[PDB]
Design a protein around this ligand. Sequence first.
Ligand code: J40
Ligand code: CLR
Ligand code: CLR
Ligand code: CLR
Ligand code: A1BIR
Lengths: 235, 288, 336, 57
Amino acid sequence: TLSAEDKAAVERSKMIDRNLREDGEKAAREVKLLLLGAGESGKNTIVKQMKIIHEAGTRVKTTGIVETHFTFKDLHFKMFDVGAQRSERKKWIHCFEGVTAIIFCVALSDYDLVLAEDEEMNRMHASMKLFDSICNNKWFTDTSIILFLNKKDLFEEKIKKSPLTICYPEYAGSNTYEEAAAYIQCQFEDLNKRKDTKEIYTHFTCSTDTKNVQFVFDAVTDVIIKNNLKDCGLF
Amino acid sequence: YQVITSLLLGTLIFCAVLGNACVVAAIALERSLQNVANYLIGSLAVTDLMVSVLVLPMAALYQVLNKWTLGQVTCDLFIALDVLCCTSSIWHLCAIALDRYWAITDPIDYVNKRTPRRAAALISLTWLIGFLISIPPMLGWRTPEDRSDPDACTISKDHGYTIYSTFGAFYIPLLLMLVLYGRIFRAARFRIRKKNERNAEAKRKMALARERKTVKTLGIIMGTFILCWLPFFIVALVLPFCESSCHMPTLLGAIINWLGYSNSLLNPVIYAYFNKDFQNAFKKIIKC
Amino acid sequence: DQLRQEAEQLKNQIRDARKACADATLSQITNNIDPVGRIQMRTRRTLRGHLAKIYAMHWGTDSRLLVSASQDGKLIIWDSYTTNKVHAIPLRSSWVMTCAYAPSGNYVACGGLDNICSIYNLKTREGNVRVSRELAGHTGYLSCCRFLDDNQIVTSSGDTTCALWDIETGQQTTTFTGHTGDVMSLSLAPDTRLFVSGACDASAKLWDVREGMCRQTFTGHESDINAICFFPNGNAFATGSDDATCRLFDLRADQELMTYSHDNIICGITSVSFSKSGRLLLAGYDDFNCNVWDALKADRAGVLAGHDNRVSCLGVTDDGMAVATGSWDSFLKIWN
Amino acid sequence: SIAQARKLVEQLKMEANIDRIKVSKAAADLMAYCEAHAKEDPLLTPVPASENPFREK
Ligand SMILES: C/C=C\C/C=C\C/C=C/C/C=C/CCCC(=O)O[C@H](COC(=O)CCCCCCCCCCCCC)COP(=O)(O)O[C@H]1[C@H](O)[C@@H](O)[C@H](OP(=O)(O)O)[C@@H](O)[C@H]1O
Ligand SMILES: CC(C)CCC[C@@H](C)[C@H]1CC[C@H]2[C@@H]3CC=C4C[C@@H](O)CC[C@]4(C)[C@H]3CC[C@]12C
Ligand SMILES: CC(C)CCC[C@@H](C)[C@H]1CC[C@H]2[C@@H]3CC=C4C[C@@H](O)CC[C@]4(C)[C@H]3CC[C@]12C
Ligand SMILES: CC(C)CCC[C@@H](C)[C@H]1CC[C@H]2[C@@H]3CC=C4C[C@@H](O)CC[C@]4(C)[C@H]3CC[C@]12C
Ligand SMILES: CN1C[C@@H]2c3cc(Cl)ccc3Oc3ccccc3[C@@H]2C1
């Protein structure tokens, strides 16, 4: 109790506890985003689009999870890529409960193609299966989803030849970029069963300035503001 | 007669001290309820508890006996403590409205620069304003009419002091709250407003439902703050300035007084007993 | 191909042999045994300091020190007698799913969604802990790890494989293949000569450290196995599963002996452990509480309620004095 | 997926050719161990507070 070693131990415990509170406050000032999507769905294009001029504010390659730090308008973002984790999803998907939002990337030009696992499985039907699975987990009831529709210009070039009816048999209408993009967007947002709790923000990836990072910013601030209105009782 | 009034005012004090201790206790021992917002609500409960144990019992006695029987010195203390703890209560309602405002309208500050030191500074400023309003009458700003009648524990009712302690305690607090919650209402309404047809219809119904939730909430907060303290602070500004033929019916005096003090009973109900985070933590502690 | 016919008839041979060895259930033999009696354990310590979900803990062999891991990327070493934080190691990756504490008391290990096991030299010349080694080679997340000795460690991973490493060299000496699902759990034998593993294929398998071969298989559960623990004797083990039930298997009989289940439990088991004498089986659950089972009777003897969230980790002292349970609410509670 | 099936069957014949014993003998061994060490475990029988380091030093 009053021994010198006891006092030294208590002081060390106090020093450690102060550092741990300082670390917890610093860490609380970040916005954590989970990045999902199919394998060749343009995830790397998005990752690069975020880290253009502002990044990071004998090690071994991790290969499990990829970290991406970027700041935009006085807001620091953490984005986690788990595309290289080829295992059972439900074993580790609960570790990401509490993220601000989920970024899902779909390649619009994937409808003609099929997966290499089996020919009778369209790449976009697997995309909807993944979207339905992640959107309706018990852990992600209140997590909003940012949806990116990648490769618009290759999608456009294709639909002059191949119709969208090969992906959606029940579809019937003219063939042009606007009416196909709208139909696919309405198809992916119909998979939302938690309409009252969560919202889907859809965008078409452009290659102009940082309009993609502006979209993420404007969607994350909307999420935060709506959370604070619900806490206050006004939403 | 006096049996009736002593038990009606007696239950009011009991329900008040019970309601406020429960809120502080929930905060004290629940780790979930340890956020900047619930610190400011918890401090209102402390202040409102301090009113219900210190002022309200000593005031109920002056009502049922119709005389002051504690001497001139105790009464100076009663008046000072009445103008200290109750002013601090009305400025706690503005600290909460400024915190809510800075969160709806400033996400960057919310994420980056918002810490419990904010709540500590706000509570300290509230109590400082309370002291700055309640101390002047002790060191000056006092009329001999207060001490003229031993069977009376009224306030200085100096004209300049009336303006000071009536504008700095209600009328300036009121303006601030009407501006902040109007801005909050406009910001809310924006965020709300901004087969496919069924989806459209569903969204239209959800928007209207959320526009009825926000209007109901704002109407409750302000229409409980107004209907508690406004009747009192109108009379307390008029009577001293308009002396001639302005007889206050004794009955009306007491109803108005104890309608004001009922704000310390209704504040826990609206700020604590409605938000689920508290309501569910009460379930938890009740079940061992 | 046509090798499935021979595989099927060998399956039928094993089944028929196991049935001939059944003559009297444990429950018919432990029938004249006096019941344990209701167990009243009351939380003695509550350790605080983690800011996120705890996932793992491991007691020290000195029965006083213990290490824990949290999603906030901190590895705290506690003094359980005085409730004192002795060390606090900042991890490179905050996605940690397991930890282990060396039997000699000089090293700790970590691992998680990063497919790497990191080893820290606690006892150094400066008193500041640094990353002694990093072990790479697994293709999936590191599920479990246990120090075989001061220079060897056994790890299991979500690539359906386990591996033994040499810390000084840094490369995996042996690889244990044969599982068809994610390997979730792992338990070293008391003599550190064998070890068992539970997987997502609803089976438990036994391995030999030297030969690197599977000796036995155990199929009693119908869903994923999340925890496994050796009996103190070393001739049996217990498995925790999502079936809301835990089972006891015996090495020499090659079959399960007991099934601990109840109608009021429909969640999954996250952790299991045995008492010093093996009479008690402590199991953590998703229902926020730990239920104490009588190993020889399959009846509840007590409940360790008191955690606000899911109980994720659990451990019994080497001398058997006290039991520690961590949870998702970021509090370790020593019960004794 | 053919070499897989050959490896599978080669393991199954190693796990079939092992010495098994009667379930009664194993149960007897476990119970002998349990009441063999039944005094050494403070969790089974509460320990006096004088000898308990986690209640009073
Ligand atoms: C004519 C036209 C139109 C007008 C006519 C009719 C319609 C309106 C009438 C006027 C309204 C009267 C009161 C309505 C209250 C009401 O609806 O309450 C709801 C239901 O809760 C209960 O029922 C449970 C509440 C239990 C509270 C405790 C009870 C016991 C207290 C005893 C105290 C003394 C003894 C200790 C709960 O609240 P709510 O649904 O109104 O919604 C919000 C609430 O208003 C916000 O305050 C709250 O924010 P907070 O300030 O942090 O709490 C929000 O989170 C949210 O809960
Ligand atoms: C004798 C007098 C002074 C006191 C009587 C007891 C008090 C505590 C009673 C009388 C009227 C009551 C209120 C009547 C109606 C409601 C609306 C309900 O949705 C929440 C509780 C609330 C707000 C009650 C809270 C308790 C209350 C204020
Ligand atoms: C006097 C004390 C006890 C407070 C009791 C509440 C009293 C003042 C009543 C009378 C008038 C009422 C308001 C009348 C109109 C509306 C609009 C409605 O869409 C939501 C409720 C709301 C906003 C009511 C809230 C409660 C209210 C303010
Ligand atoms: C909490 C809310 C609902 C309570 C609203 C009603 C309040 C204002 C009522 C309930 C009991 C009332 C008191 C009952 C008895 C008397 C004695 C009388 O000679 C003067 C008025 C006086 C002192 C009343 C003042 C107003 C009073 C306090
Ligand atoms: C019944 N009391 C009177 C007292 C008060 C009276 C006058 Cl004239 C001015 C300031 C006052 O301080 C405040 C301030 C706010 C609320 C109540 C009071 C209390 C309530």
